[PDB]
């Protein structure tokens, strides 16, 4: 069970911050004529970030563990950053490996509106 | 380098009854056919139609099915259904980081 932030109206070039709460996950945007992209997420075992090249150095993606909640944080946006923004996990695991995403939230809506 | 994943086509403009084949070309060989599907309609999460390239996911009908490997892979939809009518995304696993393709509309054909 993944349940996101709400959605969030921002101006260009500021910074804007979604949440996802589990009830290690990944960030999947749906940006209109762009597709799904993948920005980010936190990783097995060491439960540190890692970036896809496009975003790196404005986008930063956290869990606190406690309280089973991971964030993304992006910077400076730009018109194009207008989008749908996913929380996704996959599915100790010892079948076979299987990196799909089971899991998803229900999306949090970014517009970033001159 | 990132596999880039580009569908076809952009739009599948078809009747319902009618038979449905999407395609999905990966630049580069996708490792063990490690290669998913979703569909996603207005207003909703992408759902996990078909992994590893031809397993259906539990609570999939029978309709879709997927096949393919190396650069090559399809989604058909054997019938499409009213509730068919959406985008689909295929998705690879194989190499980091993960990536998608652009999506492929499937949309009602005109009269």
């Known amino acids: 069970q993944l349940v996101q932030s709400g959605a969030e109206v921002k101006k260009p070039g500021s910074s804007v911050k979604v949440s996802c709460k589990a009830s290690?996950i990944s960030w999947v945007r749906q940006a209109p004529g762009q597709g799904l992209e993948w920005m980010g997420g936190?990783?097995?075992?060491?439960?540190?970030?890692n970036y896809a090249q496009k975003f790196q150095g404005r986008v930063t993606i956290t869990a606190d563990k406690s309280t089973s909640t991971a964030y993304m944080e992006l910077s400076s946006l730009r018109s194009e950053d207008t989008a749908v923004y996913y929380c996704?996990?996959?599915?100790?695991?010892?079948?076979?490996?299987?990196?799909?995403?089971?899991?998803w939230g229900q999306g949090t809506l970014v517009t970033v509106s001159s | 380098m990132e596999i880039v994943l580009t569908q076809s086509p952009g739009t599948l403009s078809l009747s319902p009854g009618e038979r449905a084949t999407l395609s999905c070309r990966a630049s580069?060989?996708?490792?063990?056919?490690?290669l998913a599907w979703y569909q996603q309609k207005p207003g909703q999460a992408p759902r996990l139609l078909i992994y590893?390239?031809?397993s259906r996911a539990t609570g999939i009908p029978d309709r879709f099915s997927g096949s393919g490997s190396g650069t090559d892979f399809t989604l058909t939809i054997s019938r499409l259904e009213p509730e068919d009518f959406a985008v689909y995304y295929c998705?690879?696993?194989?190499?980091?980081?993960?990536?998608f393709g652009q999506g492929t509309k499937v949309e009602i054909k005109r009269l």
């Open positions: 996704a996990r996959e599915g100790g695991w010892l079948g076979k490996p299987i990196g799909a995403f089971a899991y």
């Open positions: 290690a």
């Open positions: 936190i990783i097995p075992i060491f439960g540190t970030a």
């Open positions: 580069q060989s996708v490792s063990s056919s490690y």
């Open positions: 590893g390239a031809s």
């Open positions: 998705q690879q696993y194989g190499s980091s980081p993960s990536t």
